[PDB]
Structures are given as C-alpha cells and as structure tokens.
C-alpha cells in the first residue's frame, strides 16, 4: 500500500481491439453502455467498422467505456487511489471514478461532447517534440501564428499545437528549421483544446445545465488549472476544458509534490505511462 494516482488516457490513445477482455469480464456494464449509445460498443472497439474509432463522435465513448471498465477491474483487486487525473477525454473517466456522476450519465455526456466536436471543421493540430512551452510560443508568434494555441503541455519536451488547418501545415518547416526534433500533423479536423472550440464549449455548458453533479469523493486534478477540481462549478470547468489547454505536465508534477509514489494508467495503451516516465525522469538527475 503506497500513495497512488490513476491516470486515464484520451483522444489519440484509442486502437482497434481495445477493451476485448474487459467486455467479456463486464457483460452487464457493456449492455448498459450499448443502451446509452444506441449501437454496440464492443463492435465499435473490436471491429472498428469504417475506422469509426478515428472519428471523434465515436472515439470519445470508446475511450470512456474502456477506461471505466479498466477502472472497475483494477478496483476488484486493489484499494481506491488517493488522486485521479484524466488526460483530455480521460478527465471524464477520472470524474466518474470520483463519483461526480455515474457510469451511464458520464457516457451520455461524452456522447454529446463527441457529437459537438464532430461538427467542427477547418481545424488542425500538430505534435511537436524537442521544444519547451516558451520556445513554442515564441516560434508561433514569430511566424505570425497568433491564432494557434498550445493545446496540450504533455511533458518537458512534448506539446501539441492547435489551430487553423493551413496554418498548422505551414508551420512544419519553420519548426523543423528551428530545432523541433519532430513535427506531426494529426489526423483531426478540429483545433481541439484551442479558443476556436468556443462554440462547442458554450453549447456543452448549456447541455450540462440539465445534469446534476456531485462533489468528487477523491480529488480529481483538473486539466484546466493543474489543481484539484473544486466541490462546485464543475459544469463550468468541464465546459471550459473543451477550449482550454491541457496542463498535464504541471498536473503530474503537482501530484509528485503532494507525495504520490505510484502512477497507474487505467485504459488502453501506454501513452500516459510514457509521459509520466518523461516527467519523472526530468525531475531526477542521472547517476
Ligand atoms: C489530449 C488531446 O487533446 N487529445 C487530442 C489531440 N491528440 C492526439 O490526437 C494524439 C497526438 N499524439 C500525441 O500527442 C503523441 O503521439 C502521444 C500520443 C502523446 C504519444 O507520444 P509519441 O508518438 O511520441
């Protein structure tokens, strides 16, 4: 028994085949998911018909389901974590785990979230390796890209930028020329976690008015503030998260400052495990 945090992945971590043993182990919750969604979560995750997993309207419920079942499996065999943190979409899984809403309610929110984000066009995003936050901001401004945002601050050397599709394409060469060790235009049609998501944020906040949320029973480290979610204004903060940078790196350093000894990724893949290792390594001098 150690102080621990669970970390839940978001968009970009999904894969064809995710969740297989989990669906078999949780037939009853799989059925309830299928009832909220109106289609088979298992078929979506295991057969990826029409590569729907890459389409945000479907990606989001897919991640929610596999994350939530990964959580409940884990909870069969161990005590609950001391802290919770969800990366991007995964913030919904942390809130579920914290009892802010129940399984199916959260699934309903994510379904709506995915439909709203699915209507966004004209946007793009790129992952950049090798440049810190400050250097990224200065290169954006120096290239005239004032309407491009830093969407994810993932680790000391990994950020994700987010803005108009043509602008993200055209920034590649200049970032490469200025030292970006890698620059990859992502297969998204929206500028997620940028100010351009304001329309989605406002509509989402309106949609959330019809829901009631409980204060978290276990602290959830917000993507927006890098600090525990407050016991209220949770609806406001979840809507804001859509259009705000994801302060992941700082969230993780916070949890380490708070005494966390063990960091466990719940959900498909090793995206957050790898980021955690980068963050921890950067704080630890080599021998
Ligand atoms: C969290 C968020 O805003 N999600 C939607 C945007 N992100 C993606 O679509 C995934 C972009 N890819 C990455 O940031 C990196 O490739 C990973 C997944 C962090 C893995 O590291 P790598 O390939 O070095």
């Amino acid at each position: 028994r150690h102080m621990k945090a669970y970390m839940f992945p978001g968009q970009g971590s999904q894969a064809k085949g995710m969740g297989r043993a989990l669906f078999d182990a949780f037939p009853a919750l799989t059925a309830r998911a299928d009832g909220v969604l109106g289609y088979s979560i298992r078929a979506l995750c295991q057969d990826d018909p029409d590569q729907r997993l890459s389409q945000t309207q479907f990606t989001q419920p897919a991640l929610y389901v596999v994350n939530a079942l990964s959580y409940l499996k884990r909870r069969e065999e161990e005590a609950p974590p001391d802290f919770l943190a969800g990366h991007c979409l995964g913030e919904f899984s942390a809130l579920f785990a914290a009892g802010v809403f129940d399984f199916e309610t959260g699934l309903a929110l994510v379904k709506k979230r995915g439909e709203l984000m699915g209507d966004a066009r004209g946007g793009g995003m790129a992952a950049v390796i090798g440049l810190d936050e400050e250097r990224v901001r200065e290169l954006l401004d120096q290239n005239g890209a004032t309407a491009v945002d830093i969407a994810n601050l993932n680790s000391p050397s990994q950020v994700v930028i987010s803005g108009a599709k043509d602008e993200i394409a055209r920034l590649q060469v200049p970032f490469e020329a200025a030292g970006a060790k890698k620059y990859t235009v992502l297969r998204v049609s929206a500028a997620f976690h940028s100010r351009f998501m304001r329309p989605a944020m406002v509509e989402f906040g309106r949609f959330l008015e019809g829901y009631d949320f409980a204060p978290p029973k276990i602290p959830v480290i917000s993507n927006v503030t890098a600090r525990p979610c407050k016991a209220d204004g949770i609806r406001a903060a979840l809507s804001e998260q859509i259009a705000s940078p994801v302060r992941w790196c700082e969230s993780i350093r916070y949890l380490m400052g708070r005494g966390v000894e063990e960091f466990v990724e719940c959900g498909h893949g090793i995206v957050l495990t790898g980021l955690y290792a980068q963050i921890r390594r950067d704080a630890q001098p080599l021998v």
Side-chain angles (χ1 to χ4, degrees):
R1 208 153 154 38
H2 268 232
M3 276 185 82
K4 58 184 176 180
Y6 293 180
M7 322 183 277
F8 308 83
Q11 290 204 113
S13 52
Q14 69 275 2
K16 182 171 177 181
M18 62 193 281
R20 204 197 71 241
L22 293 165
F23 301 124
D24 296 337
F26 297 90
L29 292 166
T30 301
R32 298 307 306 178
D34 290 7
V36 170
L37 295 174
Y39 55 79
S40 176
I41 191 66
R42 170 168 222 157
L44 166 53
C45 290
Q46 296 178 202
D47 319 329
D48 189 15
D50 310 274
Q51 41 248 58
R52 306 286 227 183
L53 282 176
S54 62
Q55 288 158 47
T56 198
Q57 155 187 24
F58 302 104
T59 313
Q60 294 195 36
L63 288 165
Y64 182 94
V65 185
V66 175
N67 291 349
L69 299 185
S70 307
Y71 178 71
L72 293 179
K73 195 74 201 251
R74 195 116 225 154
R75 286 282 302 107
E76 295 175 351
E77 289 319 316
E78 63 189 85
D82 301 276
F83 300 90
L84 300 154
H87 188 239
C88 308
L89 174 96
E91 188 148 293
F92 287 80
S93 310
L95 294 165
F96 157 67
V100 171
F101 39 73
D102 297 303
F103 176 68
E104 295 99 329
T105 297
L107 186 53
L109 314 182
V110 166
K111 171 179 187 304
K112 179 69 172 179
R113 196 170 176 273
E115 294 159 357
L116 294 169
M117 284 181 189
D119 286 325
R121 301 293 143 202
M125 307 179 83
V128 181
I129 292 171
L131 296 183
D132 60 37
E133 168 187 10
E134 313 225 318
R135 182 57 184 150
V136 178
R137 186 69 259 159
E138 165 184 33
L139 279 181
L140 293 166
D141 294 342
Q142 298 172 322
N143 281 269
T146 56
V148 174
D149 296 333
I150 292 174
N152 300 176
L153 297 155
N154 288 340
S155 66
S157 220
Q158 301 208 346
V159 314
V160 183
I161 60 175
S162 182
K165 172 225 194 68
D166 290 334
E167 183 71 4
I168 290 302
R170 177 199 313 145
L171 288 168
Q172 186 161 351
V173 173
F175 266 59
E176 272 160 3
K181 306 292 194 172
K182 190 159 201 186
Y183 190 99
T184 309
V185 174
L186 302 180
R187 290 205 204 70
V188 316
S189 282
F192 302 132
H193 297 291
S194 83
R195 298 168 279 128
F196 283 104
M197 302 304 291
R198 155 133 191 139
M201 156 179 91
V202 166
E203 289 272 56
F204 199 63
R206 132 147 148 258
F207 174 82
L208 294 174
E209 282 166 6
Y211 287 86
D212 300 302
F213 275 27
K217 294 189 183 191
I218 298 169
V220 173
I221 311 313
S222 158
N223 285 173
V224 177
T225 61
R227 287 297 180 278
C229 287
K230 298 307 165 192
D232 51 52
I234 306 160
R235 287 174 305 166
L238 211 41
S239 64
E240 287 174 17
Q241 186 260 9
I242 287 164
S244 298
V246 176
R247 295 171 67 198
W248 189 249
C249 185
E250 290 161 79
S251 290
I252 294 296
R253 287 188 304 115
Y254 173 75
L255 288 171
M256 297 173 179
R258 288 300 302 284
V260 175
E261 297 157 332
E262 267 159 28
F263 280 87
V264 176
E265 188 155 12
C266 304
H268 173 77
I270 51 158
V271 169
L272 305 187
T273 297
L275 293 177
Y276 163 67
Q278 299 168 46
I279 298 156
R280 203 212 65 83
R281 173 78 274 177
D282 173 79
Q284 185 89 56
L286 301 166
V287 174

